[PDB]
């Protein structure tokens, strides 16, 4: 019943990459909510449990698959199938936890691990930080392999993580921030696998503060400014959602929208 949107890492290209991210974007947001040309996810308040999920079904050139679910409130990944067995982060509160029982239902063995998801836990699991691990196609069809063979014990707990680490990036992230679905392009296109630079991690680590200052605003203006780093790591100070609308893809919903005047 919930949306399923397929990827493979076979013969993968900037655009059937692009596809991808896009068709992943298409079934997070309605349409319903955009502000500043930004669109906005669903409202968690009021959503039907039929609507709450999407699902990524990922392939590589091993002819392995397994299938990705993705909470449309943030994009966020809460867990996966491989073959006869589920896995599930571990659940943030009990509305959280009732809902994940509406994925993956006949499968025959549900694991939920007993940590979280976020980027800290998954990064003290797997020995190393986002800016240690290297993202791109080949990385990416490495973590399918991993993660469809973790039930039979071949892949160890810190590969599972670096994995989710690598997945995550590449399909959440890339979905909020344009920027980051084109850093992926590039490393795509030449077929190099590198870490994320300091412009990603700081895009990643301040998505939801982004989200909350452009809702915010007054008529764009942030009260507050943000800062976020360039490639080199040097300063960059965001003023306004004017100079993210090439950056950022689509916002964590935080408030309404107040009503809008026209002088
Ligand atoms: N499983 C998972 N899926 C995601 O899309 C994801 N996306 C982001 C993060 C993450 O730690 N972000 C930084 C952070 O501090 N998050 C918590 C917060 O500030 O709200 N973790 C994720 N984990």
Known sequence: QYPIINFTTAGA????????IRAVRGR???????????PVLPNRVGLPINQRFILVELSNHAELSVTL???????????????????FFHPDNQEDAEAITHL????????????????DRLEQLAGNLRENIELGNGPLEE????????????????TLARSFIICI???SEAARFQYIEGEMRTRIRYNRRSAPDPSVITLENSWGRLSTAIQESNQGAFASPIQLQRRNGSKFSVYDVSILIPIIALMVYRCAPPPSSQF
């Open 13 to 20: 290209t900037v655009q059937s990459y692009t596809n991808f």
């Open 28 to 38: 997070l947001t309605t349409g319903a909510d955009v502000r500043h040309e930004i």
């Open 69 to 87: 679910a993705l909470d449309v409130t943030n994009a966020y990944v809460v867990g996966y199938r491989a073959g006869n067995s589920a896995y």
């Open 104 to 119: 993956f239902t006949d499968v025959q063995n549900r694991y939920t691990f007993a940590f979280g998801g976020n980027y």
């Open 143 to 158: 973590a399918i392999s991993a993660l469809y063979y973790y039930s039979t014990g071949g892949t160890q707990l810190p």
């Open 169 to 171: 990036q590449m399909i």
